[PDB]
Each structure stands twice: as C-alpha cells, then as structure tokens.
Amino acid sequence: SEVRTIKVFTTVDNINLHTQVVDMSMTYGQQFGPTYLDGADVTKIKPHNSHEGKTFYVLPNDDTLRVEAFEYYHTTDPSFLGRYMSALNHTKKWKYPQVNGLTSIKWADNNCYLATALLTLQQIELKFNPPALQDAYYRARAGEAANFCALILAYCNKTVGELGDVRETMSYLFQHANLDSCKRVLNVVCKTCGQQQTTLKGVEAVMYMGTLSYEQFKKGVQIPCTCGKQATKYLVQQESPFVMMSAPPAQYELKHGTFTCASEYTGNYQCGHYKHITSKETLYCIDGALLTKSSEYKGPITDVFYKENSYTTTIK
Numbered sequence: 334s335e336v337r338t339i340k341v342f343t344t345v346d347n348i349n350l351h352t353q354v355v356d357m358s359m360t361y362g363q364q365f366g367p368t369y370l371d372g373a374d375v376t377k378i379k380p381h382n383s384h385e386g387k388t389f390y391v392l393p394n395d396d397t398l399r400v401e402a403f404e405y406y407h408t409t410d411p412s413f414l415g416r417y418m419s420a421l422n423h424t425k426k427w428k429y430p431q432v433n434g435l436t437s438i439k440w441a442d443n444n445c446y447l448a449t450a451l452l453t454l455q456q457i458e459l460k461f462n463p464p465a466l467q468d469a470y471y472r473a474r475a476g477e478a479a480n481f482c483a484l485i486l487a488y489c490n491k492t493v494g495e496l497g498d499v500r501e502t503m504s505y506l507f508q509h510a511n512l513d514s515c516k517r518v519l520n521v522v523c524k525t526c527g528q529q530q531t532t533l534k535g536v537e538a539v540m541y542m543g544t545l546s547y548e549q550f551k552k553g554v555q556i557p558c559t560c561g562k563q564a565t566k567y568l569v570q571q572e573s574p575f576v577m578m579s580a581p582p583a584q585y586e587l588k589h590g591t592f593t594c595a596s597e598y599t600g601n602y603q604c605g606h607y608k609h610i611t612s613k614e615t616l617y618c619i620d621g622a623l624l625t626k627s628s629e630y631k632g633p634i635t636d637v638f639y640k641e642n643s644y645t646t647t648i649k
C-alpha cells in the first residue's frame with residue numbers, strides 16, 4: 334500500500350546524534366543494519382509510531398561513525414556495541430540501591446562481583462581514559478549505574494549471568510584508567526645472589542598477588558628465587574593513590590581503620606559468592622542491597638585495598 338516515514342536519530346556514542354528518515358514498512362535491519370533501542374535489538378522489527386524522535390544505536394558502517402565510536406569507547410572491536418547493548422538490555426532491569434552512601438546492585442545474574450567492583454571504585458581515586466567509562470561512571474556514582482555495568486561487561490568480554498573474578502574485572506578497568514604517574518620500587522634479597530631492585534609503572538605498580546597484608550609486603554614476603562634458596566621481596570617505594578593486595582581466599586581478620594575496603598569470597602573456584610567489607614566509623618559488610626555492621630571481622634578475604642600517596646621504606 335502507501336509509504337509512511339518517521340524521523341529518528343542514529344548514534345554510536347549517544348553524544349553525536351544523526352537525523353535519519355525511516356520507512357514504517359521496512360525493518361530497521363534492512364535500512365541501517367543492526368539497530369538497538371535502549372539495548373533491545375530492533376533489527377528485525379518495523380518502526381512503530383512511538384519511535385518518532387527517539388535515539389537508536391547502530392554499528393559504525395561509515396568512517397565518520399568509526400572515528401566517533403573509537404574516540405568514545407577506545408576500541409575497534411566490531412562486536413563491542415552488540416555486547417554493550419546485549420548487556421544493557423539486562424542491566425537496565427537491575428536495581429541500584431544507595432547502601433552506606435555508595436551505589437550497590439541488588440543481587441541478580443551473578444552480579445555479586447560487579448556490585449563489589451562498583452562499591453570499590455567509589456572508594457579509590459581513578460580517572461578512566463575512554464569518555465564512555467568517564468560518563469557512565471559519573472552517572473553510576475549518582476545511582477544511575479545501568480550503563481557503567483553494561484560497559485564493564487562489554488570491556489571484560491563477560492556474559493550476563495556468568496560469575497566474574499573481582500581481581501580480573503579490576504585489572505581490565507585499570508588498563509583503561511590513567512595510572513601513568515603510578516610507580517613502585519621492589520628489592521629482592523638473597524643470602525648469596527644479592528640485592529636486585531625493580532621498578533613497576535601503571536597497573537603493575539598498584540596490584541600484587543600472594544599476600545593481602547600491605548604491612549607484610551613492606552616487612553618482606555618469601556618467594557621462590559631462581560637459584561633455589563627462598564628470597565625476600567619487600568616494598569622500597571610506592572607512588573599511587575591506592576594499592577590492591579590480592580591472594581587466594583583465606584581466613585583473614587580485618588580491623589577498623591587499617592584498610593579502605595576488602596573482597597570476601599565464600600565457596601569454590603568459579604562458583605562462589607562475593608561480599609564487600611568497607612572501613613568507615615565501624616566495619617560495614619555490603620552484600621548487594623543487604624547491609625550489616627560489626628566492630629570486628631574474620632572471613633575468607635581475597636582482595637584488600639589501601640589508600641596511599643608516597644611510602645618510602647626505612648629498611649637498609
């Protein structure tokens with residue numbers, strides 16, 4: 334029969350909108366290629382009357398859109414938008430309650446580790462490079478974290494419903510944050526082999542696997558030396574706003590005011606449950622929407638975060 338149209342906007346970044354005219358007889362797919370509205374796939378759907386003036390997301394099919402996409406997300410992975418939108422379709426349905434003055438996530442689709450990562454980021458000093466993470470993270474801090482979670486999932490190449498590692502998640506995010514000015518100096522000491530000194534910049538300057546205790550890392554930790562005689566690695570100098578100390582879950586006692594926040598993991602490798610412990614006027618345990626408060630804490634801790642500016646050892 335007749336040809337009806339509506340006006341809509343197409344975007345890759347929801348910053349630069351592009352006025353398009355669509356035909357209400359043809360599917361979005363046929364006219365634009367893959368097309369999303371609020372993360373919902375509409376490729377196979379014909380325009381509705383209500384669609385007038387709404388913003389749709391499309392894949393970058395021309396060079397103008399490729400520049401706009403790369404500038405915003407800092408990636409040229411063709412699958413990225415599809416994944417960002419697939420995630421978003423789920424993450425818009427999650428509830429983000431304000432818990433202890435911080436945005437959490439009400440438990441759903443094994444998001445316990447995203448919730449824990451989100452509560453953590455709010456407590457440490459981080460500047461993201463991708464304008465996509467800068468923007469979503471600002472809105473997350475406000476209670477509006479639907480997009481930030483969908484982006485974490487997209488960057489970390491994760492499915493909705495699949496349980497993630499908080500330390501793997503955080504590493505990925507730190508790869509997309511400005512940490513150029515972060516600097517760590519380690520000394521490794523043997524009885525024979527002598528004192529070797531290394532310097533670590535960026536992600537490797539703020540992350541350590543093998544001890545939870547920041548104080549222990551400064552005193553010294555035992556490591557298997559190449560020679561075969563256990564050597565002592567100790568921290569000589571740290572320049573970072575924070576440090577992340579990680580180790581495989583173990584009964585650990587956390588004391589008020591000796592740490593910033595910690596990741597509790599109960600259960601078995603890849604199928605457990607995450608809780609967030611934070612240190613304020615007392616110890617808070619944030620379990621999605623659920624909050625409890627205690628003087629003391631012992632439990633299976635796997636990540637502890639500490640605030641820092643400049644530490645310099647007095648050793649030697």
Ligand SMILES: CC(=O)NCc1ccc(-c2cccc([C@@H](C)NC(=O)c3cc(NC4CNC4)ccc3C)c2)s1
Pocket residue numbers: 496497498499501581582598600601602603604605635
């Ligand atoms: C029987 C008993 O006493 N304890 C059981 C355990 C043995 C080992 C454990 C362990 C070891 C390391 C880390 C942990 C915790 C902190 N991490 C995860 O489980 C983990 C890992 C992955 N994906 C792998 C690819 N990137 C790592 C995905 C999701 C999760 C929750 C856990 S827990």
Ligand SMILES: [Zn+2]
Pocket residue numbers: 523524525526558559560561562564
């Ligand atoms: Zn040695």
